[PDB]
Design an enzyme around this catalytic site. Structure first.
Site, PDB file in Angstrom:
ATOM      1  N   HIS A  12       3.514  30.050 -61.263  1.00 29.02           N
ATOM      2  CA  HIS A  12       3.132  28.000 -61.257  1.00 29.02           C
ATOM      3  C   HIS A  12       3.284  27.328 -62.859  1.00 29.02           C
ATOM      4  O   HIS A  12       3.074  26.209 -62.709  1.00 29.02           O
ATOM      5  CB  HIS A  12       1.885  28.294 -61.530  1.00 29.02           C
ATOM      6  CG  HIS A  12       1.246  28.727 -60.248  1.00 29.02           C
ATOM      7  ND1 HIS A  12       1.604  28.965 -58.560  1.00 29.02           N
ATOM      8  CD2 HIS A  12       0.297  29.806 -59.959  1.00 29.02           C
ATOM      9  CE1 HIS A  12       0.724  29.263 -58.081  1.00 29.02           C
ATOM     10  NE2 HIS A  12       0.267  30.516 -58.645  1.00 29.02           N
ATOM     11  N   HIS A 117      -5.652  31.553 -60.790  1.00 29.11           N
ATOM     12  CA  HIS A 117      -5.089  31.609 -59.329  1.00 29.11           C
ATOM     13  C   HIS A 117      -4.997  29.637 -59.191  1.00 29.11           C
ATOM     14  O   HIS A 117      -5.870  29.113 -60.130  1.00 29.11           O
ATOM     15  CB  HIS A 117      -6.005  32.020 -58.458  1.00 29.11           C
ATOM     16  CG  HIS A 117      -5.580  31.563 -57.368  1.00 29.11           C
ATOM     17  ND1 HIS A 117      -5.177  32.023 -56.405  1.00 29.11           N
ATOM     18  CD2 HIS A 117      -6.767  30.545 -56.662  1.00 29.11           C
ATOM     19  CE1 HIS A 117      -5.568  31.668 -54.844  1.00 29.11           C
ATOM     20  NE2 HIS A 117      -6.647  31.040 -55.247  1.00 29.11           N
TER      21      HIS A 117
END
Ligand SMILES: O[C@H]1CO[C@H]2OCC[C@H]21
Ligand SMILES: O[C@H]1CO[C@H]2OCC[C@H]21
EC number: 4.6.1.18
Length: 122
Positions: A12, A117
């Site tokens: 990410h 996450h």
């Protein structure tokens, strides 16, 4: 292999500002997100690692799975959404690159307490 924190950065993080229309096609591959299969969706954050890590001390919100360790950024962040197309078929994964400025929600864990996450963008 890598840690959950390291995996988050690989999947990410992209501090290198607003992402081309070929961005996701190149990034999803280079970050090894198309190894076993074509990952349906993914999001890259164009903010410094420090700014994303700071989210772990921001707005506490519920995670999509019911856990309570999710945090929403107080300010919007530059992000790029990668969504697999219909014509996309492994190992030739095709993606639609969409840039945006939205608040991010990440789950944090460990000591140091860091993002592990990417939950959502709102
Ligand atoms: O899918 C198209 C959109 O932009 C082009 O440049 C490289 C690949 C390309
Ligand atoms: O499975 C079929 C549906 O659309 C085609 O284009 C690429 C792969 C394909």
């Amino acid at each position: 292999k890598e840690t959950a924190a390291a995996k988050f950065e690989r999947q990410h993080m992209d501090s290198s500002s607003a992402a081309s229309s070929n961005y996701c096609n190149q990034m999803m591959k280079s970050r090894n997100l198309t190894k076993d299969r074509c990952k349906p969706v993914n999001t890259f954050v164009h903010e410094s690692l420090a700014d994303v890590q700071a989210v772990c001390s921001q707005k506490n919100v519920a995670c999509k799975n019911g856990q309570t360790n999710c945090y929403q950024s107080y300010s919007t962040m530059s992000i790029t959404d990668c969504r697999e197309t219909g014509s996309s078929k492994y190992p030739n994964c095709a993606y639609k690159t969409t840039q945006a400025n939205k608040h991010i929600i990440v789950a944090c864990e460990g000591n140091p307490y860091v993002p592990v996450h990417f939950d959502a963008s709102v």
